Write a protein that binds this ligand. Sequence first.
Ligand code: HEM
Length: 423
Amino acid sequence: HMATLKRDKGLDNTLKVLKQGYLYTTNQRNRLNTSVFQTKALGGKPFVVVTGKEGAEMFYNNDVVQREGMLPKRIVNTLFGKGAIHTVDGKKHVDRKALFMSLMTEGNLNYVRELTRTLWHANTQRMESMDEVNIYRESIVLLTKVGTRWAGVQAPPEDIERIATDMDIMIDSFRALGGAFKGYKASKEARRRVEDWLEEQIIETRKGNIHPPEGTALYEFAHWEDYLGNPMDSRTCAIDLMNTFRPLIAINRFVSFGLHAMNENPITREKIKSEPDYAYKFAQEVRRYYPFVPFLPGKAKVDIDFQGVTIPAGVGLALDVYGTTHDESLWDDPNEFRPERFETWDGSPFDLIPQGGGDYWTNHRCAGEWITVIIMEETMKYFAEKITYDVPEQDLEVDLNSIPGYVKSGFVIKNVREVVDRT
Ligand code: HEM
C-alpha cells in the first residue's frame, strides 16, 4: 500500500517555522527529499504540508478537506473576527460567500479602479510637499479612503489616519501564527474599535437613519438574509463587513513591494508606460513573487492517498502558498521578477495561489482577488507615469525568513514631482 509520511520531527516546531519564515517548507522538502511532509506545530498538532497544483487541487476538494475550526483562535480573534466567513464551511459558507461575490460586479470593480486613480491623482500635491514619503504608510492611508468609500462606509477625513493604523495592526496580527506576542492585545483593541464603529453603521442602516447606496457592502450586508431568512446579528455583520475592506487596505503591502520591484528592475517602469497590458502582468508578478500568505490550514476528513503517502483522517493540512508561487516546475526561474511570464499563463486556479486556490463560490478562495489586481494596476501606473521621485539610501531588504513579508523601510521616496507637459 502507500509509504510512510516523512516528518520534520519534534514535539512542536512553531519556533522553527517562525525562524525560517517563508522558507520553512521549502527547507524541509529539500532536506527530506520529498514533496510532502508532516510537522507538529501550534501546540503539538500534526500538519501535513502539501504543495503545487496537486496539493492545491486536493486542499480545495471539499469532500476530503475541512477548513472550519482550523484557524488558530488568536488569529480569528484579531485578523478575521469571531464568526467571520473564514470560520464557516458547507451550506452556511456557500450562502454567505455568495453575498461577498455579489459585490464583485463589473460596475463595482470599475468603481474601485476609478476611486483609486482619482485619489492618487488628488494626492500628488501632498506628496510633493513632504520631505520624504513612506509608501507603506501613505498607501495604507489612501487605501483606507478607497476602501471605506467603496464599501459605502462614511469615514470622516479626520478619522482616516486612526482607522488606517487600526487596520494595519490587525492585518499584521498573523505574525505569531496564533501564538502569544507583545502586540496581541493592541491588535484585539484595534479590532474592538473598528467592529464597534461598523456595528453602529449597520444598526443605523437597519433603522433607516443612514442611507448607504444600494450595491455597496454596507447596504448589502446590513440587509442580507441567510438561506433560512435570518439576517446576520449586528456584530457578525460588522465583522464580515470589515472583511470586505480591511483586506483592500492590506493591498498597501503589495504597493510597497511593487515600488520595490520597480526600483530593483527599472525597465519595468518604462514597460508600464509603454505597453498597455503590462501593468496587469506587473501586478500579477508582484502577487506571485513577494511574500504575504505563507500557508493555509485545513484538516483531512478521511484518509487521503496523496503523492505516495496516506494522509490519515483527522490530521491537519497546510497548503503551501509561498512554495506553490515559487515552485520551479510551475514558474521558470521562480525567484526572478519577470512580469512577461504572464504572457503564457493559462489562468489555472491551482498555481497562482497567493490569495488562495480553487473556486470563488464554493471554496474559501479570496473574494477580493480581482480588486487587488485592479488596485495594483492603477497604483503602479500612477507611480510609473504620473510622478517622478528619488529613492534614498535605506533598508530595502525583504527578509524571507520573517513573517510577515515587508520591505524593512516601508519603501521611502523623496523629491516627488508631478509629470506635466506644459508645452
Ligand atoms: C491584500 C492582499 C490580499 C491577500 C494577500 C489576500 C489573501 C487571502 C487569502 C490567502 C484568503 C484565504 C483563502 C483560503 O482560505 O482558502 C483570503 C480570503 C478572503 N479574502 Fe483576501 N486577500 C487580499 C485582498 C482581499 C481583498 C481586497 C478583499 C476584498 C475586497 C478580500 C476579501 C477576502 C474574503 C472575504 C476572504 C474570505 C473568503 C472565504 O473564506 O470564503 N481579500 N484572502
